[PDB]
Design an enzyme around this catalytic site. Structure first.
Site, mmCIF file in Angstrom:
data_model
loop_
_atom_site.group_PDB
_atom_site.id
_atom_site.type_symbol
_atom_site.label_atom_id
_atom_site.label_comp_id
_atom_site.label_asym_id
_atom_site.label_seq_id
_atom_site.Cartn_x
_atom_site.Cartn_y
_atom_site.Cartn_z
ATOM 1 N N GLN A 1 0.823 -1.199 0.000
ATOM 2 C CA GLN A 1 0.000 0.000 0.000
ATOM 3 C C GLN A 1 0.863 1.258 0.000
ATOM 4 O O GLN A 1 0.502 2.260 -0.633
ATOM 5 C CB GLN A 1 -0.949 -0.037 1.200
ATOM 6 C CG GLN A 1 -2.059 -1.062 1.032
ATOM 7 C CD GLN A 1 -3.017 -1.165 2.226
ATOM 8 O OE1 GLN A 1 -4.176 -1.507 2.048
ATOM 9 N NE2 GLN A 1 -2.527 -0.902 3.436
ATOM 10 N N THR B 1 4.479 -11.483 6.841
ATOM 11 C CA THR B 1 5.102 -11.412 5.522
ATOM 12 C C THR B 1 6.137 -10.294 5.467
ATOM 13 O O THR B 1 7.272 -10.502 5.029
ATOM 14 C CB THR B 1 4.043 -11.177 4.458
ATOM 15 O OG1 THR B 1 3.064 -12.229 4.498
ATOM 16 C CG2 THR B 1 4.692 -11.095 3.086
ATOM 17 N N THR C 1 -1.797 -4.372 14.431
ATOM 18 C CA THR C 1 -2.781 -5.446 14.308
ATOM 19 C C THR C 1 -2.396 -6.712 15.059
ATOM 20 O O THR C 1 -3.072 -7.739 14.893
ATOM 21 C CB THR C 1 -3.007 -5.804 12.835
ATOM 22 O OG1 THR C 1 -1.744 -5.835 12.158
ATOM 23 C CG2 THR C 1 -3.907 -4.804 12.180
ATOM 24 N N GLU D 1 4.150 -8.010 17.391
ATOM 25 C CA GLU D 1 4.943 -7.161 16.507
ATOM 26 C C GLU D 1 6.331 -6.874 17.052
ATOM 27 O O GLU D 1 7.279 -6.866 16.250
ATOM 28 C CB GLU D 1 4.183 -5.863 16.191
ATOM 29 C CG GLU D 1 2.948 -6.178 15.352
ATOM 30 C CD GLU D 1 2.374 -4.990 14.615
ATOM 31 O OE1 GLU D 1 1.133 -4.941 14.466
ATOM 32 O OE2 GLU D 1 3.155 -4.123 14.172
ATOM 33 N N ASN E 1 5.121 4.526 12.580
ATOM 34 C CA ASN E 1 3.694 4.828 12.442
ATOM 35 C C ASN E 1 3.208 5.764 13.552
ATOM 36 O O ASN E 1 2.314 6.581 13.329
ATOM 37 C CB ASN E 1 2.860 3.550 12.449
ATOM 38 C CG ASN E 1 2.580 2.997 11.043
ATOM 39 O OD1 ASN E 1 2.867 3.634 10.031
ATOM 40 N ND2 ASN E 1 2.012 1.792 10.988
ATOM 41 N N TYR F 1 -4.755 4.344 7.052
ATOM 42 C CA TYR F 1 -3.563 4.003 6.288
ATOM 43 C C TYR F 1 -3.423 4.906 5.070
ATOM 44 O O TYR F 1 -2.303 5.222 4.661
ATOM 45 C CB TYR F 1 -3.589 2.525 5.887
ATOM 46 C CG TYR F 1 -3.287 1.578 7.033
ATOM 47 C CD1 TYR F 1 -2.363 1.922 8.021
ATOM 48 C CD2 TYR F 1 -3.926 0.337 7.129
ATOM 49 C CE1 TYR F 1 -2.079 1.043 9.081
ATOM 50 C CE2 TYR F 1 -3.656 -0.534 8.172
ATOM 51 C CZ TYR F 1 -2.729 -0.184 9.143
ATOM 52 O OH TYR F 1 -2.469 -1.061 10.177
ATOM 53 N N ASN G 1 -0.129 6.817 4.529
ATOM 54 C CA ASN G 1 0.706 6.442 3.401
ATOM 55 C C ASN G 1 0.956 7.600 2.453
ATOM 56 O O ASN G 1 2.039 7.682 1.864
ATOM 57 C CB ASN G 1 0.077 5.268 2.655
ATOM 58 C CG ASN G 1 0.155 3.974 3.450
ATOM 59 O OD1 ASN G 1 0.974 3.836 4.366
ATOM 60 N ND2 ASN G 1 -0.701 3.022 3.112
ATOM 61 N N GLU H 1 25.732 6.095 -3.254
ATOM 62 C CA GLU H 1 26.038 7.362 -2.603
ATOM 63 C C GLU H 1 25.281 7.515 -1.297
ATOM 64 O O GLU H 1 25.776 8.182 -0.377
ATOM 65 C CB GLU H 1 25.728 8.524 -3.550
ATOM 66 C CG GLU H 1 26.251 9.871 -3.089
ATOM 67 C CD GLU H 1 26.143 10.961 -4.153
ATOM 68 O OE1 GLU H 1 26.411 12.145 -3.826
ATOM 69 O OE2 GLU H 1 25.800 10.626 -5.311
HETATM 70 N N1 LIG Z 1 2.045 3.020 7.507
HETATM 71 C C1 LIG Z 1 1.418 1.883 7.229
HETATM 72 N N2 LIG Z 1 1.519 0.802 8.090
HETATM 73 C C2 LIG Z 1 0.882 -0.356 7.797
HETATM 74 C C3 LIG Z 1 0.113 -0.473 6.646
HETATM 75 N N3 LIG Z 1 -0.411 -1.714 6.632
HETATM 76 C C4 LIG Z 1 0.024 -2.395 7.737
HETATM 77 N N4 LIG Z 1 0.823 -1.546 8.459
HETATM 78 C C5 LIG Z 1 1.516 -1.803 9.728
HETATM 79 O O1 LIG Z 1 2.384 -2.925 9.616
HETATM 80 C C6 LIG Z 1 2.121 -3.825 10.675
HETATM 81 C C7 LIG Z 1 1.363 -5.053 10.166
HETATM 82 O O2 LIG Z 1 2.038 -5.585 9.042
HETATM 83 P P1 LIG Z 1 1.330 -5.944 7.636
HETATM 84 O O3 LIG Z 1 1.980 -5.302 6.431
HETATM 85 O O4 LIG Z 1 -0.129 -5.558 7.635
HETATM 86 O O5 LIG Z 1 1.511 -7.560 7.627
HETATM 87 P P2 LIG Z 1 1.864 -8.463 6.330
HETATM 88 O O6 LIG Z 1 3.170 -8.107 5.664
HETATM 89 O O7 LIG Z 1 0.726 -8.428 5.325
HETATM 90 O O8 LIG Z 1 2.070 -9.939 6.944
HETATM 91 P P3 LIG Z 1 0.815 -10.936 7.191
HETATM 92 O O9 LIG Z 1 -0.493 -10.267 6.782
HETATM 93 O O10 LIG Z 1 0.944 -11.247 8.661
HETATM 94 O O11 LIG Z 1 1.017 -12.171 6.335
HETATM 95 C C8 LIG Z 1 1.293 -3.045 11.670
HETATM 96 O O12 LIG Z 1 2.192 -2.246 12.412
HETATM 97 C C9 LIG Z 1 0.501 -2.111 10.806
HETATM 98 O O13 LIG Z 1 0.145 -0.956 11.534
HETATM 99 C C10 LIG Z 1 0.013 0.613 5.779
HETATM 100 O O14 LIG Z 1 -0.657 0.535 4.751
HETATM 101 N N5 LIG Z 1 0.670 1.794 6.077
#
Ligand SMILES: Nc1nc2c(ncn2[C@@H]2O[C@H](COP(=O)(O)OP(=O)(O)OP(=O)(O)O)[C@@H](O)[C@H]2O)c(=O)[nH]1
Ligand SMILES: C=C(C)[C@@H]1NC(=O)[C@@H](NC)[C@@H](O)c2cc(Cl)c(O)c(c2)O[C@](C)(CC)[C@@H](C(=O)N2CC=C[C@H]2C(=O)N/C(C(=O)N/C(=C/C(=O)O)C(=O)O)=C(\C)CC)NC1=O
Ligand SMILES: Nc1ncnc2c1ncn2[C@@H]1O[C@H](COP(=O)(O)OP(=O)(O)CP(=O)(O)O)[C@@H](O)[C@H]1O
Ligand SMILES: Nc1nc2c(ncn2[C@@H]2O[C@H](COP(=O)(O)OP(=O)(O)O)[C@@H](O)[C@H]2O)c(=O)[nH]1
Ligand SMILES: [Ca+2]
Ligand SMILES: [Ca+2]
Ligand SMILES: [Ca+2]
Ligand SMILES: [Cl-]
Ligand SMILES: [Mg+2]
Ligand SMILES: [Mg+2]
Ligand SMILES: [Mg+2]
EC number: 3.6.5.-
Lengths: 338, 437, 54, 428
Positions: free
Chosen positions: B15, B145, B179, B183, B206, B224, B228, B254
């Site tokens: 995203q 992931t 989520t 974490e 965040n 988000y 973002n 660099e």
């Molecule tokens: N800034 C920002 N943080 C995000 C976003 N989506 C998820 N996060 C953050 O990243 C963490 C969760 O990771 P995700 O990217 O959603 O997890 P993933 O890589 O999809 O891994 P799984 O779904 O567990 O297979 C949490 O801290 C969320 O707040 C986003 O679109 N923008």
């Protein structure tokens, strides 16, 4: 209801502060490692400043200023004064001092001789109980093997009756807005033994530590209780003997030194725009020489109060530093204005 | 010209990648169909924008991007969204079953079964690069992931592209939008495995972004999308020098040279100014002095921490808009007398400065007001280690009781990987403290 | 403060100002640890199925 | 991770299961016909989680109906949505289980279980990515209790890598006078401790007390009890059935809720508490939802939350409201009652908001807690168990099906160990 946590069990001042907070009936004490607190009374060393201000829904206040140590540890106070333009090397109220490692070694040698060169007194004191005053440059560097070496005030103001040395302790509160509050009550830490110009390793009367005097000095408690003279008595002594007052002769210089010290480091430690907020209680220690000029000997970042005043100072900490930020349902400080 | 491949891993990386490429096209005059009317070399070329886009004979400009998530919900709305035509189906890679916020699941279990597909789809991109210089890797710390598969891929990229440089844009976890309770574990795990493989990582907390949105965009509860589009502004400003004519930070090499003298301490702090609500009726345009001074306010940092109580090793100022060097040097002279900027003794006290005359681009209908001039500071200060302490503390509280550990072990991970990771972090914390105090 | 390395072009400019001078595992080893976890899983699963068979 | 296979077993399991399918079907715009007639497309985004699509754009619950007695399932067939269930998923015998765990688990249930697993398999095999199973059953009778936990052990052996989730109704002497229910329940808990990932403890003791004291119902019916159950089941599956960020599939929920494998028994809570066909004309404010949903009077397990500590908590808010106000209200319960949240699991309360409210209410909230105070519930079953077991009373009903005393001794030991493992973590 507000929450706080206590991480310095050894602190007389904030032990009282905690009791007063609970007696309000609007403050709750959590356990040391609970992070959902409004107020941390922190440990004296390696306080986790980096963990404050990261708890959503909680305004967080702590009773130390990160970075105040550079005012509060011997060698760093000297470097702070010498290297800050606002204090300057050209500073009229700090005893000429030098940082010596077991560096300004040969820096100090030139100043020693210029005075022996010039028909001058050459007494000096070495500081860090490991406490050594001499006229020998040999004997100090003899003993060093970090430490500070500074001028000994050879001609102190001596009280009568007694020919007694002393120093002054000023308690200063600095709130989260960086208001600088001076507590109206100071305290005089007096020597029980008359002052001597020849007995230098006879440290009975050359060091006015309240620890040294209680039972390492013979005449303890003689002239005043605890070797503690308050400001009421000391001012009357200045009036009766010297035809002046505390405010005019000494307190002005003390107010100027305090404000000049905390203003200097203010950019480095202010929490004005930070995600957590600080306050702190400092103890300022002054010598007064015989021409009624005030000198700063050091700054204590974790001071204790004198017994008589605990109830009043700790109430002022609460009113000014704590309920400033966390309100509840003739001031004892004087505000040093910048 | 030397090509740069961008990899977006997990929901967060995908995203954020979405918002970045959208901004990129707006900045470069590429339409959602991928056409660039102003590119007058039809069918190819080697301009500075070609670092991030390839070209088709039909004249389509194509992001040098691969998206990978272990479940399809997120990338699917790429495939069906506004920029659906921009990307090649080969570029968007999905699993079916995600990592359930479990590092071990994304690294060991699901990671072993998709790592080779992903490298192949990456290899199709490199084959099209005359002189690939390396990778920009986008991911969360907190997702399974983003943490577990990312560390897998970074180990393999180091094998298959041993000389190419690798940069990270890393989302550090914040309870206000997180989520999962594990974490902290994921963050320490993936930092430990990815450390040797990352030349330069830009960490965005965040929490900081959340508050910048609340206090400077008047957004009551940032989403988000709010988060973002701000991140993408900051990312745009960091990559701008790779996509536009200029002489500072011209290739990925660099960034390490300018920003990372010690290879383990490779986490520059980013500070951005100004952030102005587009719905704000009256706004006084801020001066070069005022936006440069805001670069030293923690409230504008991507990580809340106090650079006054650390030391600097490098500093870059990246200006966009109406800025000339004379204004910058006066701003810096003034700031230097009013602020606490201490460098480590072996580095010179000084600033590298890049100016690009075009002001930042804003999304139409976004939260950000278009401004005259803006700046991004990239400063390698030891104060960023405050964020390691926070995270490491949270890991310790949980690990001491072995809470949730069984979820990782159940995936084939050995409990000892935890304490290895945590000891690597403890060493990091000590390196920062020696350099900085 | 000395400005140095000034470069200009139509799109912007670039320079440096100095306030004060200075005072990887194989593919094999990765395949090894991926497969060492895979059979840690399969042992744990097998043990569950043995128990369920009892 | 998309599809869930729903299994309902026994009288309680089928009565509470049918009301669940009633409630969520109306939430998703499915009518007894099996056809969609809703407005929002939020209704259909994740419909595949619980419904199989047929060609006529008809939606069939992925639901399997099990009993050792035809009676109740006949009653499900002729009730409101009874015609939405695909007929070959009705799997039943004629014996009955006579409120006898041994009959459900070892003899009568044995005869029938394989034919149930054939239906499971057919429904499983036709999933794109099956995420696991949910089972509804009482623990106090014989079928849902004994055959339900037999089914779970079989499913676990053939799908060892899927999530097993139950809604388990706990017996209370306030609403049952069947003397052997502590035996059945203790034997079931032993099974649940080993072979499920997440179990919602739905305590008939709590259901009765709420009905009598709060809804002022002097003679609570099963419909009154199940009205609380179906609200709870709607709330706690909300994150699975609608688009969202938190606990959106069974496994992520398990990772967020279960720090130790055995401590997977959840205490649901709900607000506002409603009686069947009640008026409920005043919408709740976000502060009301938040205080009510954490109140002991709103929990569906008869346990005092102040008597333990929360390990993990999920809160789900339904309806149109201020996410900002939801955030600050949630942050305030934590910051004001922080002692009750274990310090060694930071940030253990996760909050979700869904725009679609349940029928009848503009605003509602559902609580799901992993509290060490759940031990009170297992203590109660244990005290009722040992009172009979120390005299080996009523055992002949079980030994005559082939069971041995020692299987009882093993069961009560495991449950007592569970209780002790909760007390462990209540003392950091
Ligand atoms: N800034 C920002 N943080 C995000 C976003 N989506 C998820 N996060 C953050 O990243 C963490 C969760 O990771 P995700 O990217 O959603 O997890 P993933 O890589 O999809 O891994 P799984 O779904 O567990 O297979 C949490 O801290 C969320 O707040 C986003 O679109 N923008
Ligand atoms: C005296 C009887 C018959 C029995 N009482 C006891 O067993 C008591 N013995 C100490 C005690 O156990 C008890 C007391 C009280 Cl106050 C109870 O409410 C009680 C049990 O609850 C039940 C078992 C139902 C929860 C309650 C019960 O079964 N009831 C109460 C009113 C009707 C029936 C009932 O619920 N029948 C239904 C039913 O659904 N009834 C409904 C009635 C209605 O429409 O209001 C409905 O909601 O559909 C079913 C068996 C399921 C289809 N049982 C009793 O009251
Ligand atoms: N330059 C100086 N000239 C004369 N006397 C001095 C002096 N410096 C210190 N003293 C005397 O030595 C005493 C103790 O010295 P010092 O400054 O080390 O206090 P201290 O910190 O070691 C004990 P504390 O911090 O509790 O006050 C002073 O109170 C004063 O009596
Ligand atoms: N809450 C609730 N409890 C029920 C229902 N039906 C039965 N019970 C309880 O379930 C237990 C008896 O189990 P039951 O399901 O009737 O036996 P089974 O058919 O052999 O599985 C007793 O504790 C009953 O109070 C119901 O519809 N709702
Ligand atoms: Ca071209
Ligand atoms: Ca490398
Ligand atoms: Ca038979
Ligand atoms: Cl290479
Ligand atoms: Mg994901
Ligand atoms: Mg068969
Ligand atoms: Mg029955």
């Amino acid at each position: 209801m507000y929450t706080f946590v206590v991480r310095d069990e050894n602190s007389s001042v904030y032990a009282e502060v905690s009791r007063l907070l609970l007696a309000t009936g609007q403050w709750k004490r959590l356990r040391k490692d609970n992070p959902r607190f409004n107020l941390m009374l922190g440990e004296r060393n390696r306080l986790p400043f980096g963990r404050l201000g990261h708890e959503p829904g909680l305004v967080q206040l702590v009773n130390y200023y990160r970075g105040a140590d550079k005012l509060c540890r011997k060698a760093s106070l000297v470097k702070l004064i010498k290297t800050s333009p606002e204090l300057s090397e050209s500073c009229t109220w700090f005893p000429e001092s030098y940082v010596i490692y077991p560096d300004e070694r040969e820096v100090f040698l030139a100043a020693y001789n210029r005075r022996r060169e010039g028909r001058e007194g050459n007494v000096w004191i070495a500081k860090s109980e490991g406490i050594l005053i001499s006229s020998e440059a040999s004997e100090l560097l003899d003993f060093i093997d970090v430490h500070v070496i500074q001028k000994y005030l050879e001609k102190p103001l001596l009280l009568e009756p007694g020919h007694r040395k002393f120093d002054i302790r000023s308690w200063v509160l600095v709130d989260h807005l960086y208001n600088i509050y001076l507590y109206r009550e100071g305290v005089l830490r007096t020597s029980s033994e008359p002052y001597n110009s020849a007995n230098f390793q006879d440290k009975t009367c050359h060091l006015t530590n309240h620890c040294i005097q209680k039972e390492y000095s013979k005449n303890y408690g003689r002239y005043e209780e605890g070797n503690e003279m308050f400001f009421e008595e000391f001012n009357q002594y200045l009036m009766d003997a010297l035809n002046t007052t505390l405010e005019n002769s000494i307190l002005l210089q003390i107010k100027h030194i305090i404000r000049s010290c905390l203003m200097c480091i203010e950019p480095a430690i202010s929490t004005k725009h930070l995600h957590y907020q600080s306050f702190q209680l400092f103890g300022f220690d002054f010598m007064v020489d015989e021409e009624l000029k005030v000198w700063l000997i050091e700054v204590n970042g974790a001071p204790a109060c004198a017994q008589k005043l605990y109830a009043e100072l700790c109430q002022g900490i609460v009113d000014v530093a704590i309920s400033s930020v966390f309100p509840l349902a003739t001031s004892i400080f004087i505000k040093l204005h910048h | 010209m030397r090509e740069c491949i961008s990899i977006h891993v997990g929901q967060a990386g995908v995203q954020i990648g979405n918002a970045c490429w959208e901004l990129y096209c707006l900045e470069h005059g590429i339409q959602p169909d991928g056409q660039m009317p102003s590119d007058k070399t039809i069918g190819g070329g080697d301009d500075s924008f070609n670092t991030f886009f390839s070209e088709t004979g039909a004249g389509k400009h194509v992001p040098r991007a691969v998206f990978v998530d272990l479940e399809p919900t997120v990338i699917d709305e790429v495939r069906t969204g506004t920029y659906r035509q921009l990307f090649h189906p080969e570029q968007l890679i999905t699993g079916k079953e995600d990592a359930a916020n479990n590092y071990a699941r994304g690294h060991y279990t699901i990671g072993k079964e998709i790592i080779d597909l992903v490298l192949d789809r990456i290899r199709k991109l490199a084959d099209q690069c005359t002189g690939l210089q390396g990778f920009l890797v986008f991911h969360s710390f907190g997702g399974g992931t983003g943490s577990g598969f990312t560390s897998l891929l970074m180990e393999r990229l180091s094998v298959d592209y041993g000389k190419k440089s690798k940069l990270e844009f890393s989302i550090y976890p914040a309870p206000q939008v997180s989520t999962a309770v594990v974490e902290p574990y994921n963050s320490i795990l993936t930092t430990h495995t990815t450390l040797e493989h990352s030349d330069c990582a830009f960490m965005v907390d965040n929490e900081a972004i959340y508050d910048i949105c609340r206090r400077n965009l008047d957004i009551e509860r940032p989403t988000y999308t709010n988060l973002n589009r701000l991140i993408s502004q900051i990312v745009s400003s960091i990559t701008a020098s790779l996509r536009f004519d200029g002489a500072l930070n011209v290739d990925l090499t660099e960034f390490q040279t300018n920003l990372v003298p010690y290879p383990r301490i490779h986490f520059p702090l980013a500070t951005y100014a100004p952030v102005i609500s587009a719905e704000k009726a009256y706004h006084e345009q801020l001066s070069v002095a005022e936006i440069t001074n805001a670069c030293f306010e923690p409230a504008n940092q991507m990580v809340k921490c106090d650079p006054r109580h650390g030391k600097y090793m490098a500093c870059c100022l990246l200006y966009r808009g109406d800025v000339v060097p004379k204004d910058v040097n006066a701003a810096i002279a003034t700031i230097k007398t009013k602020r606490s900027i201490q460098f480590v003794d072996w580095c010179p006290t000084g600033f590298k400065v890049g100016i690009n005359y075009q002001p930042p681009t804003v999304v139409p209908g976004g939260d950000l007001a278009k401004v005259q001039r803006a700046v991004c500071m990239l400063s390698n200060t030891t104060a960023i280690a405050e964020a390691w302490a926070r995270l490491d503390h949270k890991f310790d509280l949980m690990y001491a009781k072995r809470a949730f550990v069984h979820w990782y072990v159940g995936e084939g991970m050995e409990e000892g990987e935890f304490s290895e990771a945590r000891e690597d972090m403890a060493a990091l914390e000590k390196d920062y403290e020696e350099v900085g105090v | 403060m000395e400005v140095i390395e000034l470069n200009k072009c139509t799109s912007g400019q670039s320079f440096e100002v100095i306030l004060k001078p200075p005072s990887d595992p194989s593919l094999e080893e990765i395949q090894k640890k991926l497969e060492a976890a895979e059979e840690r899983r399969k042992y744990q699963e097998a043990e569950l199925l043995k128990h369920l068979a009892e | 991770m998309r599809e869930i296979v729903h299994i309902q077993a026994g009288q309680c399991g089928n009565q509470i299961g049918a009301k669940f399918w009633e409630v969520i079907s109306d939430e998703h715009g499915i009518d007894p016909t099996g056809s969609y007639h809703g407005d929002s497309d939020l209704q259909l985004e994740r419909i595949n989680v619980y419904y199989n699509e047929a060609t006529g754009n008809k939606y069939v619950p992925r639901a399997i109906l099990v009993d050792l007695e035809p009676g109740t399932m006949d009653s499900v067939r002729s009730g409101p949505f009874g015609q939405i269930f695909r007929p070959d998923n009705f799997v039943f015998g004629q014996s009955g289980a006579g409120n006898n765990w041994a009959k459900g688990h070892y003899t009568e249930g044995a005869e029938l279980v394989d034919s149930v697993l054939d239906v499971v398999r057919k429904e499983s095999e036709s999933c794109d990515c099956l995420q696991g199973f949910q089972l509804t059953h009482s623990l106090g009778g014989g079928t849902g209790s004994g055959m339900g936990t037999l089914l779970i052990s079989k499913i676990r052996e053939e799908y060892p890598d899927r999530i097993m989730n139950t809604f388990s109704v706990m017996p209370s002497p306030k609403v049952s006078d069947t003397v052997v229910e502590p035996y059945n329940a203790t034997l079931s808990v032993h099974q649940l401790v080993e072979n499920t990932d997440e179990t919602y403890c739905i305590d008939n003791e709590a259901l009765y007390d709420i009905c009598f004291r709060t809804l002022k119902l002097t003679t609570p019916t099963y419909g009154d009890l199940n009205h609380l159950v179906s609200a709870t089941m709607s709330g706690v599956t909300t994150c699975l059935r609608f688009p969202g960020q938190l606990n959106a599939d069974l496994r992520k929920l398990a990772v967020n809720m279960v720090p130790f494998p055995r401590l997977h028994f959840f205490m649901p809570g709900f607000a506002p508490l409603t009686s069947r066909g009640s008026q409920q004309y005043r919408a709740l404010t976000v502060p009301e939802l938040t205080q009510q949903m954490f109140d002991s009077k709103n929990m569906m397990a008869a346990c005092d939350p102040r008597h333990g500590r929360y390990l993990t908590v999920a809160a789900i808010f339904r309806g149109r409201m201020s996410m900002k106000e939801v955030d600050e209200q949630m942050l305030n319960v934590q910051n004001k009652n922080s002692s009750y949240f274990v310090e060694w699991i930071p940030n253990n309360v996760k909050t979700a908001v869904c725009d679609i409210p349940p029928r009848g209410l503009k605003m509602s909230a559902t609580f799901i807690g992993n509290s060490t105070a759940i031990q009170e519930l297992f203590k109660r079953i244990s005290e009722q168990f040992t009172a009979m077991f120390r005299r080996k009373a009523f055992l002949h009903w079980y030994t005559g099906e082939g069971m041995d005393e020692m299987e009882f001794t093993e069961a009560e030991s495991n449950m007592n160990d569970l209780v002790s493992e909760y007390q462990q973590y209540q003392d950091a």
